[PDB]
Amino acid sequence: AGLLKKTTGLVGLAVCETPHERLKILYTKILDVLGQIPKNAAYRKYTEQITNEKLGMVKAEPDVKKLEEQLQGGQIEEVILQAENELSLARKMLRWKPWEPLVEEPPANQWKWPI
Amino acid sequence: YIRPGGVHQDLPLGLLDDIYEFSKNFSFRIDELEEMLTNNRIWRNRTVDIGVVTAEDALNYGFSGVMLRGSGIQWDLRKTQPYDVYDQVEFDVPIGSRGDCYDRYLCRVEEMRQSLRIISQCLNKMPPGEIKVDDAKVSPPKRAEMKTSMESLIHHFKLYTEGYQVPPGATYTAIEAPKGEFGVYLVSDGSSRPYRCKIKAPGFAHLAGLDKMSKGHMLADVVAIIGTQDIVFGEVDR
Amino acid sequence: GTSVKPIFSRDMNEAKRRVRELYRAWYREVPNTVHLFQLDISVKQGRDKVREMFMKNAHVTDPRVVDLLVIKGKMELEETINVWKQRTHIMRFFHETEAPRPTDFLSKFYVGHDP
Amino acid sequence: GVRTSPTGEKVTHTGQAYDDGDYRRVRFSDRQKEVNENFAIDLIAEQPVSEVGSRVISCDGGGGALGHPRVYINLDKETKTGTCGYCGLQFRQPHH
Amino acid sequence: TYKFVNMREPSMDMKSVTDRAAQTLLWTELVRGLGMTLSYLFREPATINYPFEKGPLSPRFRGEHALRRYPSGEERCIACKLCEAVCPAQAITIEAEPRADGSRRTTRYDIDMTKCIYCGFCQEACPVDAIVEGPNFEFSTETHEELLYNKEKLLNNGDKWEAEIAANIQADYLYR
Amino acid sequence: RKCDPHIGLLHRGTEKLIEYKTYLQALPYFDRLDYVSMMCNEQAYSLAVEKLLNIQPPPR
Amino acid sequence: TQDTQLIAVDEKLDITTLTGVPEEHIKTRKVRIFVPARNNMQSGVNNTKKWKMEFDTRERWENPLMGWSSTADPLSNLVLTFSTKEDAVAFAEKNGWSFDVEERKVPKPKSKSYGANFSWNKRTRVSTK
Amino acid sequence: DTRPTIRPRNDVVHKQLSAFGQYVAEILPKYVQQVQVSCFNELEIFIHPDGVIPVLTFLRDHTNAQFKSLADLTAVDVPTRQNRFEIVYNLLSLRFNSQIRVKTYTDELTPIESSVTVYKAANWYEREIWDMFGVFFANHPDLRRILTGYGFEGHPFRKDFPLSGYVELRYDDEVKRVVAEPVELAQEFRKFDLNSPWEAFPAYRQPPE
Amino acid sequence: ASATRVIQLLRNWASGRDLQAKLQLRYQEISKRTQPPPKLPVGPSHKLSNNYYCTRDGRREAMPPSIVMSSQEKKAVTPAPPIKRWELSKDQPYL
Amino acid sequence: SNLIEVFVDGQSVMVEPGTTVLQACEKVGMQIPRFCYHERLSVAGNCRMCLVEIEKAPKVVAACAMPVMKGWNILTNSEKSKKAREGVMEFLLANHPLDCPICDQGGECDLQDQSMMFGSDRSRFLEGKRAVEDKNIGPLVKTIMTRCIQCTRCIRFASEIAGVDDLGTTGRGNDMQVGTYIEKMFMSELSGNIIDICPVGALTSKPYAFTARPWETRKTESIDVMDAVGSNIVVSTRTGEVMRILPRMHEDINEEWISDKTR
Ligand code: SF4
Ligand code: SF4
Ligand code: SF4
Ligand code: SF4
Ligand code: FES
Ligand SMILES: [K+]
Ligand SMILES: [Zn+2]
């Protein structure tokens, strides 16, 4: 499945010796939080599409290096790092919740910048 | 010298020879600099493991240029977003490993050496032709034509009095400056003068992070962690 | 149109409240500031100059505006407390070097075309 | 040349010279009032009037690119001469 | 294409550790630093004996300004105000008036040499090569007012550095 | 403990002064922002102005 | 349509106390709102489409030195552009400036016919072409 | 090539940017008012001021955006609008090699949620915006003047602030201290009205009102 | 003011490299400061025919920024395809 | 009911019948470049720059004189029109003298500005330019007749708004010169207005001649007091001095002219 890399190169990004399960558990938590999102939101369908590809993607390939190459996300440690961000984004997305229509149409000439 | 639409005037005859002569011995002079410090026990102890920043910390703090390169982040506008003819020259970006002062100083020295190869390629591949865009409405016409033809005189007159009106729009270009990601948010309005020229300062976000990098280090290391900062104080203050 | 979200204060009452302790925070340290900066001027003319600056900003009748001067005065207090302003910056409030500009119409007519 | 003023001060080619009662003169005391001597108004007069057998001429001030932009003067009025605006050199048709 | 600048792991064999220990106790990289300072001591200093040996310049050098005149003698400036219009720092002030003889020149042409940025934009804008930046760069003065040149001082410069400015533009006009 | 870098000791009004000048007139300002990166500064401004103008410089 | 602790702020915007302008330059200055007329030397109209804001001129003496046009009024070169009179007239008292407004002068449409140049009866027949 | 002077234009980048512009527009219709791709392949997103934090957070954290570097934060002062200030965000995505522009609007008296939480780089950029223009930001840690001198009055970059300023400085010997005086320029700034009265670009001909 | 060989051996040994080959001072290899006059070329548009400005106006072909969505299944789309990972240098991988 | 409909650049425009193409283009906002066509004076056609392409029409029409009719799409920015404008200006700048640094019209010259917008960026005229002897028409009007483009604006103004017939065109071909033949001062209370209508520096003002530049003067609107008409004028001031009093436009009081005593 690939030898344990001595370092990730990036400072602070510690090497994850067990990255496969970490990706699987976080991705399941992604679809978990997306459950609290009603269907109508474009955020739900898009994020589910991204994660569902990724979830069936991490489980298929057992090797780390083929996973990193095919994921197109750099080192594996970045993938858990970004998947964590997607988790926090979806959680705080639930608060603001931008499915609602535009809060206020701007003034007539706020945009349109020839002076 | 560098002006919109090219350069002011062509190189004086015989300049490329002097550039080649100077670049020939500059490799030795670089070795002169780095030999007395790179392995010097006093130097490393004064910079190693000092001003260490993480990867995500540097990205969030707006750090750019060497500071991303010096701490593992493989980013360089000369390769990712090539401007001018930077897509034709070959060079190596010196990614750092530890991220402290010593790694970035090494990245600076290596970036010094790598520029020599880019200098070598530019000297050996300099093409013939003009030095300004062949369009009088943007670049001024040649002095020989300005004293000879009607259109050149009028364009020279209007270009040096009013200037070239630019289309109304806003842009943000950036280049791999020798310190960071120097850029300008230029906003026009269709007139001959800019409406707003915001100047991206590579040192601004750099100096904003000085408190983060100085956390815990002794005061005598504050000079080391601003030395690797490379804050020229005409850019931060603008 | 007639309604816009506020800064800190919801009406004039709490806006006036934030002025009072700002004046309190400005009264107390004036002798301390005079001692700190080796002010030539005594304490007494320091206190009313704070009073006069607070007095000239009296016609304001907008909660959003009063918040802006309140926070701006706070920075001015902050700049003075942690020796960010020197003697020259403090003496700037006392307009000393410039001659008094007369207010009668006759004097203005004598000196220039100033309306 | 240079004409001295009645107060005893050199007059510039522009005609500038401080009045006797002008206070803005103490600057010149213990110093010297910078004035050029080669009055271009005079020196251009000494240039001979060139005579060419053509209705129009082209003057560039000599030196090609080193001179003024090329202009064409219409030497048709036999009453007077045609002078280039940039440099001031005169031209005249010899009895047409 | 990236290269790892600092990813060298020292060897742990008995030879390498002793060399590092020998380097530590018997200061070697410090001696190498010392040994090279001695090398520069015996070298050739690059100092130029100012003011007996002035530095090397180029014909394009921008220094003290001067108004030149035609070979006839009449000034080149015809007061088109291009130099004043393009001056980035607005250091140029020009006032023109019909001359007595006809063809008219400036009555006031003042350059504020403490406001000038020496960008050279004036000499490019000039369509008659009237205002130029001469080769002189040693016009430092004791008083601020002496810097504020007017037409007379500039015309004097044109009649002083003409023997040098003429040659410079003679060598550089083809490039422009 | 904290490092508060008070800046503004050389806050020349470059961004406001640029507005009042033309695009060619504003060129020398960028040489005077970073005292050491001269052509690099002008290169950024030149690229910005060329991008708005939809005009490219010659290969030389 | 925005519940952000909305309160009634009916009173007119009075940001003057925040712009830092000294007391003198805030009352005794009379700004003018006008559409600039075309430069009569030229014939183009692309400079008469935006409302301009300008401050009344003040003293302009001559230096004891070479004699530039000195001044002591900072609000001398300040010219602002507005796309509509209402926006322009609103920016004045919001900043607290006494103003006078001159309505835009629209060149009235004039009927022009080439055939009139050669008229059988009317005195509009030209004598040269 | 038939266009040796005209800058070449990329359509593939235009399509990719346009597709992403629609992507962000559908994701957060609560704030995204309008979106446009400029001719030189640059994307601008026009959000409502309340969406300053949510929109930036999405661009910073979404797996398909990953814009993780605030290049700069500036505003353009346009007095002719009701909300004269126009705050502009510039973000760069290292993973996807692209840049985005997020712009809001704000009048004189309105606080904007400081983006220090999302981008810690904004912290110092926020102070410049307040100092130069006067836009106050709520929840900012240490909002104070950054560039202007201590006890400075007004906001310089505002279009209604004179270029020369209101006050100059001088060492007064009577008080033996540097003092401030009303400005008195030796030579007034000669303003140059150099706008040609002939239309420049018919493409941006604003339709008549 | 090229020094004695005794110094050259000492100077070279003290630095550890041949310094006489590449020196910090320019003796004669510089280009002469009096160069022959140049003949600058012309731009591509320096033509007497078929060179109308309407076909080469860079400024007049800048359209206004096209809007894609305005307030007044579809695959998720990234702003641009993710960058390829940089490969190690070949001239000198590890410094 | 009479309003016929036209398509200025495709956009529908309601125009009074008998309206010229140029005014129809102005209705949308596009200003057709012009030299001879002055709104107050008659329409001549010597300019040839008002040329524009009418859709599905092979011949470029002169917008200064052509009356529109039903369903016309005035393609202002069509390629054929742009080639026409470049060609016409090339002829204008063929014999124009290189006087821009010494011409008072510099900075406010219609020929200069229209060259920047609708015109080429060089010249292919490797010939010898023409030169015309100057004429004297009084101590008020600078006459450098070599710069004239024979737009006949001065001729039209003299015979229409002034009433005196002394300005005309003598000779044919390229040698045609506009002037007064026999030497005679063009004197009238509206004589100075020929300075304004002239699009080039051929006719300029002697009293102000080469004392300032248009880009450096500050224009201040005011009202003339010399006469009782109260003509609106634009007083141009630079460095606290008065150089020019230019007329303003009011369309009721002074139209676009001022008296010589006013100027
Ligand atoms: S070199 Fe000096 S005088 Fe000439 S344009 Fe530049 S700033 Fe003005
Ligand atoms: S650019 Fe030359 S000719 Fe024109 S005003 Fe300046 S000095 Fe005189
Ligand atoms: S009339 Fe116009 S084109 Fe002719 S010289 Fe004067 S400014 Fe130049
Ligand atoms: S003198 Fe002027 S107005 Fe008269 S025809 Fe010539 S250009 Fe036209
Ligand atoms: S405008 Fe119709 S021909 Fe001159
Ligand atoms: K005219
Ligand atoms: Zn001549």
Contact H203 I63 (CB under 8 A): yes
- CB of H134 within 8 Å of a chain I CB? The answer is no
H-chain residues near E90 (CB < 8 A): 189-190
DSSP code for G115: G
Contact H39 I78 (CB under 8 A): no
Under 8 Å CB pairs connecting chains I and J tally to: 16
Cβ-contact I82, A78 below 8 angstroms: no
Contact A104 G2 (CB under 8 A): yes
In chain F, how many H helices and how many E strands?
Answer: 3, 0
The number of residues in chain J equals: 263
Q: Method used for this model?
A: cryo-EM
Give the chain J residue nearest H191 (alpha carbons): J216
Residue J50 is assigned to a ligand binding site: yes
Atom of ligand 4 nearest to the CA of J152: 5
Nearest CA to ligand 1 atom 4: E122
Contact F55 I43 (CB under 8 A): no
Closest ligand (CA of J66): 5
Angle B150-161/J110-117 helices, nearest 10 degrees? 90
Contact E93 H187 (CB under 8 A): yes
> Counting Cβ atoms within 10 Å, is residue H60 exposed (0-12), middle (13-18) or buried (19+)?
buried
Cβ-contact A33, B120 below 8 angstroms: no
Q: Residue C115's CB: how many other CB atoms inside 10 A?
A: 11
Quote the CA–CA distance of J256 and J232 in Å, as a whole number: 9
Q: Rg of chain I's alpha carbons, rounded to an integer?
A: 31
Strand partners, D31: none
| D67 Cα to the center of ligand 7, angstroms | 8
Contact C89 H136 (CB under 8 A): no
Residue J154 is assigned to a ligand binding site: yes
Contact B173 F14 (CB under 8 A): no
DSSP code for G46: T
Q: Residue E131's CB: how many other CB atoms inside 10 A?
A: 23
3-state SS, residue D57: strand
Quote the CA–CA distance of J110 and J89 in Å, as a whole number: 11
3-state SS, residue C109: helix
J109 in ligand 4 pocket by Cβ < 6 Å?
no
Nearest chain E Cα distance for residue I29, angstroms? 15
Under 8 Å CB pairs connecting chains H and J tally to: 36
Quote the CA–CA distance of C70 and J259 in Å, as a whole number: 60
Cβ-contact B39, E29 below 8 angstroms: yes
The candidate with the shortest Cα–Cα distance to B199, out of I23, J230, I58, F14, is F14
- CB of J148 within 8 Å of a chain D CB? The answer is no
In chain G, how many H helices and how many E strands?
Answer: 2, 5
Contact A49 I85 (CB under 8 A): no
Atom of ligand 2 nearest to the CA of E130: 2
Angle at J66 between CA J60 and CA J71, to 5 degrees: 85
Cα Dmax for chain F = 53
Displacement of CA E6 from its chain's centroid (Å): 40
Beta pairing class for D90-92 and D50-51: parallel
Tally of CA atoms within 13 A in the half-sphere of C24 that contains its CB: 6
Cβ-contact C51, C58 below 8 angstroms: no
The candidate with the shortest Cα–Cα distance to J189, out of J166, J229, J215, J162, is J162
Quote the CA–CA distance of B196 and A109 in Å, as a whole number: 19
Closest ligand (CA of J42): 5
J21 in ligand 3 pocket by Cβ < 6 Å?
no
Give the chain E residue nearest F18 (alpha carbons): E88
| Chains touching C, CB cut-off 8 Å, 3+ pairs | G, H
F-chain residues near E86 (CB < 8 A): 24-25
A72's CB contacts (< 8 A; 6+ apart) are: I82
Atom of ligand 5 nearest to the CA of J34: 1
Atom of ligand 1 nearest to the CA of E86: 5
Cβ-contact E94, E70 below 8 angstroms: no
Residue I62 is encoded by which pair of tokens?
Answer: 């800048």
3-state SS, residue D37: coil
Residue G38 is encoded by which pair of tokens?
Answer: 């075309």
J151 in ligand 4 pocket by Cβ < 6 Å?
yes
The candidate with the shortest Cα–Cα distance to B112, out of B67, B195, B178, B164, is B178
The reported resolution of this PDB entry, expressed in Å, is 3.5
Cβ-contact G117, J158 below 8 angstroms: no
J143 in ligand 4 pocket by Cβ < 6 Å?
no
Q: What is the dihedral sign for C-alpha B156, B158, B161, B162?
A: negative
J146 in ligand 3 pocket by Cβ < 6 Å?
no
User: Distances from the Cα of E164 to the Cαs of B71, E139, G119, in angstroms?
Assistant: 54, 16, 70
Residue D59 is assigned to a ligand binding site: yes
Phi-psi group of D8: left, alpha or beta (phi > 0 → left; psi -120 to 50 → alpha; rest → beta) = left
A 44-103: CB under 8 A from H: 46-47, 50, 73-74, 82-83, 85-86, 88-89, 92-93, 96-103
Q: Residue G115's CB: how many other CB atoms inside 10 A?
A: 10
Quote the CA–CA distance of A81 and A19 in Å, as a whole number: 11
Displacement of CA J19 from its chain's centroid (Å): 20
**With touching defined as 3+ CB pairs under 8 A, do chains A and D touch?**
no
| J88 Cα to the center of ligand 5, angstroms | 11
Cβ-contact J135, J185 below 8 angstroms: no
**With touching defined as 3+ CB pairs under 8 A, do chains D and C touch?**
no
The candidate with the shortest Cα–Cα distance to C50, out of C71, C17, C76, C75, is C76
Quote the CA–CA distance of G40 and J263 in Å, as a whole number: 13
Indicate the number of domains in chain C: 1
Strand partners, J53: J75
Range of the domain at C53: 1-115
E83 in ligand 2 pocket by Cβ < 6 Å?
yes
Atom of ligand 5 nearest to the CA of J36: 4
> Counting Cβ atoms within 10 Å, is residue E53 exposed (0-12), middle (13-18) or buried (19+)?
exposed
> CA-CA-CA-CA torsion for D25, D28, D34, D38, nearest 10 degrees?
70
